[PDB]
Every structure is written in C-alpha cells, then in structure tokens.
Design a protein around this nucleic acid. Structure first.
Length: 137
DNA sequence: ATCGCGTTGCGCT
DNA sequence: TAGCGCAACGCGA
C-alpha cells in the first residue's frame, strides 16, 4: 500500500487510481485493531514520514489527513471521468479520536513522496498517462 | 467479455 | 520468529 503527500492534481492517472483504492486500506486496518481493543500507543508510529517498513503505521494517528485526502482524491477521479463506484467519503466518526489527527506534511517529506512517484513512472514512462495521454516519455 | 498494470506494508496463522 | 495473502477497482489494449 502507499499513500503520497503529493498534490493529487499532478498524479499520473494510474497513480491516482491506485491511491483511490489503496488509501481506504488504512481506515480498515485501524478499525480492526480498534475491534481488537488496541490503542494508538501500542504501535510503533514513526516520528517522521517514511516509505516502506513503518509507512502505513505512520498514518495511524493521521486518519483526518487521509479522510480529507480521500475527498480530494475522489474529486480528481471524477474530473477525469473514471467510473468510480465509491463517490462518498467514508464515515470515521466510529474510531477513537486518538487515531483521528491531522498531519501537516513537511517540505522534505513531500519531496520524498515525489521521488518514489517519479521513479515508478520512469520504470514504464510510455505507459503512464495523464488525463488519458502519455505525457511522460 | 478478457488480460495486464498500478503498492506494498502489515495482520494473522 | 517466519511466511503467506489480504486490502475502496477501473482503465486501456
């Protein structure tokens, strides 16, 4: 799974879709632990953004950032006209507030997010499209 | 109607 | 501890 701090407006159509269906994977992971009775401090949450091991856990006390991000993601998808079935931002009022914090990415964390996108496109530049067209490559 | 491709970490056994 | 498969799907060829 992967969450980017990248502005959704410049996301490659593919990276935009992958994020649409991937982001919601965190709300569910948290709900499940909450079901298991786990608390936010029973998790090794990173002090700073990271990609890889510790990545999604990082977002375990930033459910707002994502919730809000979900609204942004949904918008862009519609703009480009992708027939998405879930046009509704999910209701996370059922989760202990300790998990629902906002998060203000630092300029350095974002650049890191970009780097990944920018090296994942390069693996297949002709294949990545923006609003239907292969602007990369 | 079908097939490849997009992420990759983390929860559970 | 180690390994395994899960977890918001829809588009272009």
């Amino acid at each position: 799974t992967r969450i980017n701090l990248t502005l959704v407006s410049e996301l490659a159509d593919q990276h935009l879709m992958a994020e649409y269906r991937q982001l919601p994977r965190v709300f569910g992971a948290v709900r499940k632990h909450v079901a298991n009775g786990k608390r936010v401090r029973d998790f090794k949450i990173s002090p700073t953004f990271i990609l890889g091991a510790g990545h999604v856990t990082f977002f375990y006390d930033k459910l707002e950032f994502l919730r809000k991000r979900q609204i942004e993601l949904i918008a862009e998808c519609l703009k480009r006209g992708f027939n998405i079935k879930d046009t509704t931002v999910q209701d996370i009022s059922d989760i202990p507030q300790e998990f629902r914090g906002d998060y203000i990415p630092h300029e350095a964390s974002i650049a890191i997010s970009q780097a990944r996108l920018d090296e994942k496109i390069a693996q297949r530049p002709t294949w990545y499209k923006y609003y239907g067209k292969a602007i990369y490559a």
